[PDB]
Every structure is written in structure tokens, then in C-alpha cells.
Amino acid sequence: SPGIWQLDCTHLEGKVILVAVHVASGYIEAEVIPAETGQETAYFLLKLAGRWPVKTIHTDNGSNFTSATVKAACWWAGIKQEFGIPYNPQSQGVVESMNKELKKIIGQVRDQAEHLKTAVQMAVFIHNKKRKGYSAGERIVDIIATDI
Amino acid sequence: SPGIWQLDCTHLEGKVILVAVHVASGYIEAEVIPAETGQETAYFLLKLAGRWPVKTIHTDNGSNFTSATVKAACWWAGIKQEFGIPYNPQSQGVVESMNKELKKIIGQVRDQAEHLKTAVQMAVFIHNKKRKGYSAGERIVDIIATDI
Ligand SMILES: Cc1nc2c(ccn2Cc2ccc(F)c(F)c2)c(-c2ccc3c(c2C)CCCO3)c1[C@H](OC(C)(C)C)C(=O)O
Ligand SMILES: Cc1nc2c(ccn2Cc2ccc(F)c(F)c2)c(-c2ccc3c(c2C)CCCO3)c1[C@H](OC(C)(C)C)C(=O)O
């Protein structure tokens, strides 16, 4: 489904990186957030939902979607709650692979910037433009355009 | 051209809103930034360029693209410098109209949130999904997919 995104946080240098993966394409949106809080996740979801047609959110940590602020963002944006991760052999290992690739790229470009957030955005850019043939960026735009 | 974006800052409640308009579609990306600085504009451009294929940036304030940090972001992302705004009757008034519409929507939803940044993201969501027929969100994905 083109409306499914998986959101997870990863920790690096005492900072938190919120990583959203568009499951059907492997496209990533990421932000360095001041703390792993419900208010940060809610704000991130409102931004994401205004940029792409988000129908469902998945995660490897269900408790991060329990706060009143996150429930309010999903209610307002019309995003449906997902219990666990439904078995889908087509997307098996895709989210883990995209997160592994992003982490590797961050490590590879880290010394090119002072701030971790700068290295993270360089890594998102490299990841989204990398041809695998099409790139994740080309794939998401094709998937969504064809779904419209 | 599908690679042209116009970036400008607007001021509201003592805060700064950086508004990026995809000129061919009217699609918007916006963020509330802590101050009108070169480092904030540079970071915003790196994020934008990793999400969409940005070729050229326009603005109504040329001096905001003179810092070493902004020049570095454009160099790394391969974004070309534009002197003034070239005459294009097809896009006449589009950026001004999109900014006017965003400002009106912010005013309309402002009392639904505590934080201005929340109202801004609600406004971006409403703007991008509004059918004018297609929405700006549907138009950008069609323009970029067809350009690929
Ligand atoms: C924090 C920061 N400063 C930057 C720069 C560029 C110039 N300067 C000024 C400067 C002057 C003298 C130095 F000795 C020095 F080390 C840096 C980028 C920057 C901006 C864009 C960019 C890159 C860099 C390094 C790398 C490739 C992708 O695009 C930075 C940068 O921080 C912001 C993006 C927030 C401005 C950083 O983290 O280093
Ligand atoms: C700051 C903030 N808090 C929120 C909420 C929701 C619950 N709460 C807790 C709360 C509890 C008791 C209250 F009396 C009270 F006023 C708010 C949103 C929020 C989150 C998402 C959202 C909306 C709201 C209001 C409006 C529609 C779009 O989606 C907020 C919100 O701030 C963050 C998004 C940063 C969490 C805000 O600015 O109000």
C-alpha cells in the first residue's frame, strides 16, 4: 500500500533521529529531534502528512504512539492506528534495510559536517537519490502519481 | 520548469516562517525557524533538496542567499544561483498567491493550536490537499513523475 510509512527513532551522539520510511519505495524523511517525546512525534507526523498522503503508520515501538499529542495528530490528519506490523512478505526487511543504509551513509559523511543534523540530511539526500533501475525518490513520486 | 522553488520568510507573532513554494504546482514546504539566519536557510535547503529534485531557487530577498553556509548548501546539492526573478508570464503572481493563501489558512486555524508552528503545519496540510481539478500535492507528484 502506498499510504504506509514506518516511523522509528535511532540514537546517535546523545541525539535522537526520527526516521520515517515510505515502505513501498524505501524513500526516507528524517529529522534530528531534541528528545524522544510524544510532542516531537506528533509535530513530525503533522509535517509528514501535509507533504505526502499518509494513511497508516507502522513502528517497531508501539508505545511511542500512545500520548495524547500523537493520538491528536493522527486523528486530525486521518491516520489510522496499526497494532503491530501485519505480515507482508513483499516488504520483508525493507524498513530494516533502509535504516541500515541510512546509518551507514551517516557514518560515511559524518566528518564532512560539524552538526550531526547536517550529516543526517546529507545522508537522506544521498539515500533518496541513489539508483537501485530507479531511486527511492523516483519510486515514491511514481507510486503516488499512479495511485492518484 | 519543475526544479524551481521560491523561498521567502514571513514574520508572525515574533517568529519566522520559512516558506518554500514549488512554482509549477503551488505546493508548499514550510518550517518555523528560531531566527532569520544563513545557517537556518542552509539547513532548510539541504532538507528540501533531499526530498525533491531542486534545480533552482528564487526569492524576493536576494541578500538572504549570500552567507557562506547557504552558498555551501547550494554547492553541495547542485543548486544554481538565480539573479532576480526572470520574467515568466505563466507563473506571474503564483508565489504571491500561494503565500497569501497560506497566511489566510494560518489565521483561520490559529485558535485550534497552542503553538504557531502547529498552526503553520495544519495550514501547509490544508493548502497542499485543497483541490483547485487537482490539489498542489497531486500536481507536484504528477509534474515530477512525468519529468522523470
Ligand atoms: C556549521 C556550518 N558552518 C559552515 C558550513 C559551511 C560554511 N560554514 C562556516 C564555517 C566557517 C569556518 C569554518 F572553519 C567552518 F568549519 C565553517 C556548514 C555547511 C553548510 C552546508 C553544507 C555543509 C556544511 C558543512 C556540508 C555539505 C552539505 O551542505 C555548516 C553546517 O551546519 C549548517 C548546515 C547548520 C549551517 C555543519 O553542520 O557543519
Ligand atoms: C501543545 C499541544 N498539546 C496537545 C495537543 C493535543 C493534546 N495536547 C495536550 C493538552 C492537554 C491539555 C490541554 F488543556 C491542552 F490544551 C493540551 C496538541 C496538538 C497535537 C496535534 C494536533 C493538534 C494539537 C492541538 C491540532 C490539530 C492538529 O494536530 C498540541 C500542539 O503542539 C504539538 C503539535 C507540538 C504537540 C499545539 O500546538 O497545541
Residue numbers in the entry:
A (entry chain A), B (entry chain A): 57 to 188, 193 to 208
Question: Mind quoting what the paper says about this structure?
Answer:
During the early steps of HIV infection, IN catalyzes the initial covalent attachment of the viral cDNA to host cell nuclear DNA. The catalytic core domain (residues 50–212) adopts an RNase H superfamily fold and contains a D,D-35-E motif that binds Mg2+ or Mn2+ ions, which mediate DNA cleaving and joining. IN function is assisted by the cellular cofactor lens epithelium-derived growth factor (LEDGF/p75), which binds tightly to a site at the catalytic core domain dimer interface. An additional class of IN inhibitors, the allosteric inhibitors of integrase (ALLINIs), act at a second site on HIV IN.
To investigate the structural basis for ALLINI function, we studied GSK1264 (described in) and GSK002, which is newly reported here. Structures of the GSK1264, BI-D, and tetraphenylarsonium (TPA) complexes were reported previously; the structure of GSK002 bound to the catalytic core domain at 1.75 Å is newly reported here. To investigate the mechanism of GSK002 resistance further, we determined three high-resolution crystal structures, one of GSK002 bound to catalytic core domain-only, one of GSK002 bound to the catalytic core domain containing the Ala124 substitution, and one of GSK002 bound to the catalytic core domain with Thr125. The protein structures were quite similar, with RMSDs ranging from 0.09 to 0.13 Å in pairwise comparisons. A small steric clash is also predicted for GSK002, in which the difluorobenzyl group collides with Trp235. However, rotation of the Trp235 side chain could create enough space for the inhibitor, so we suggest that GSK002 could be accommodated in a nearly identical interface. Thus, this analysis supports the concept that CTD–ALLINI–catalytic core domain interactions are relevant to aggregation in vitro and that the shape and positioning of the ALLINI molecule is critical for the aggregation reaction. We speculate that the IN polymer formed in the presence of GSK002 is similar to that seen for GSK1264, with side chains remodeled to accommodate the interaction, but how these small structural differences influence inhibitor potency and escape mechanisms is just beginning to be studied.
